[PDB]
Ligand binder design. Sequence first.
Ligand SMILES: C[C@](O)(CO)[C@H](O)COP(=O)(O)OP(=O)(O)OC[C@H]1O[C@@H](n2ccc(N)nc2=O)[C@H](O)[C@@H]1O
Ligand SMILES: C[C@](O)(CO)[C@H](O)COP(=O)(O)OP(=O)(O)OC[C@H]1O[C@@H](n2ccc(N)nc2=O)[C@H](O)[C@@H]1O
Ligand SMILES: [Mg+2]
Ligand SMILES: [Mg+2]
Lengths: 225, 225
Amino acid sequence: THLDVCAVVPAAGFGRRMQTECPKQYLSIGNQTILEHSVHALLAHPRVKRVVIAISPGDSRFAQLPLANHPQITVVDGGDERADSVLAGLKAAGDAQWVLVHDAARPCLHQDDLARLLALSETSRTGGILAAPVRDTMKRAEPGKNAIAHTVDRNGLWHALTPQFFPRELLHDCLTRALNEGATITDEASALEYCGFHPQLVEGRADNIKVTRPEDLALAEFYLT
Amino acid sequence: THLDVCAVVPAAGFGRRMQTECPKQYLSIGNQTILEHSVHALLAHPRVKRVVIAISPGDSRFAQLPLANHPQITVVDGGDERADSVLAGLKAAGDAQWVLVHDAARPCLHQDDLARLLALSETSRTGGILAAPVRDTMKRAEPGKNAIAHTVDRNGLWHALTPQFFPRELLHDCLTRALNEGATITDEASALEYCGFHPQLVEGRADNIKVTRPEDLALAEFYLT
Ligand SMILES: C[C@](O)(CO)[C@H](O)COP(=O)(O)OP(=O)(O)OC[C@H]1O[C@@H](n2ccc(N)nc2=O)[C@H](O)[C@@H]1O
Ligand SMILES: C[C@](O)(CO)[C@H](O)COP(=O)(O)OP(=O)(O)OC[C@H]1O[C@@H](n2ccc(N)nc2=O)[C@H](O)[C@@H]1O
Ligand SMILES: [Mg+2]
Ligand SMILES: [Mg+2]
């Protein structure tokens, strides 16, 4: 039972950066929706016993997918921001000791990256995330201007990706505390950070992209080909 | 003569992150090398009168390209690091008032992005660069560990791309000074920054990628399709 993992997939975003009245997670690549691609990647690993998917209360396309009746899938309503949807998913996680949180919008997840992340439960007490090294020179803009303030050192700088793997109750409590104290939480690692922890960085493939913009769809298809 | 622009293309990298004994800039996409794609993008704009390409002293494939005999192209030897190759190119720029520096490895440059960058000479005294907003949550790693120190705010954070457009002598002098004082210079904007300036950020397409890794080739082809 120690190895059992519960997954949480925040998929309640309206994605108004997609322009289309059709959510990005519901767009299709091959014979499946982006959401299904993401969920099947998690279900592909033996340890992932359950997947909790958080959707919008006004979401009516989920019930029309094969996942709707899957014995390992549980559906709950998400919240205003990603962190809220993730929290609602965590509350239905169960007794699982460890939780995997993965964006519905990242359908290109490979099994090797996933297995390497999952190994953290046997070598870590706080958990970690998949991540990709920064390549371009990075620039910090001036507060209210489109001019360069200074360069941000790309060395030691990483792109946070998902899944993000953490002990269930610890993540639950850190996220609740951060949100209650009105902190800025853009991922799960951010919640552990707010509570004083420092999650591990597990290098994953950079082709594990997030589909948010219209063009992202085409690119995601390319990678899945 | 005020509008005349000289371009500098650093292409002296051995690219040992490509694995192949064949430099990334010399790989082919369609009926052309990556280098030719990059150079033609600059030559496509009327203002770009000359292009100085910096290559490795041991580079023997350049002379076998059609660009070798192009009336607008000048070839010089590059240096140990990118900043050195760029400096050598600048010394052969001529009397051009403004210089455009573009990585040989970024063949997906679009004309609209280029024209918007070039407009800076009529609205700026210091210049600017093409850049793309950061999307993922960013993480700063701990000095000697693969653990997260803290999150780096993605708001106001940009991916520096190229071309980078600056007054010729100013760039020349700032780069010389920075290099002499042993500063870290990963792009041209960094040199103006070292001398106290703050270049403008011009949003460009994120598909204007840099080909450094083996897989980058395939992706670049996709974008050029
Ligand atoms: C977690 C990271 O991938 C780490 O780089 C990013 O911080 C996510 O950044 P992001 O701006 O939150 O990205 P988005 O594409 O808007 O959202 C990622 C996932 O959160 C979900 N989401 C977003 C807002 C919301 N109220 N409920 C949600 O369930 C989206 O449906 C999507 O599957
Ligand atoms: C300028 C930026 O694109 C801004 O994001 C990056 O800072 C460049 O970062 P980078 O690590 O320098 O990237 P690379 O792919 O190794 O180099 C970009 C360009 O510099 C050239 N280059 C590199 C090293 C060297 N001694 N001479 C060169 O002329 C390469 O040939 C390539 O066309
Ligand atoms: Mg959002
Ligand atoms: Mg280099």
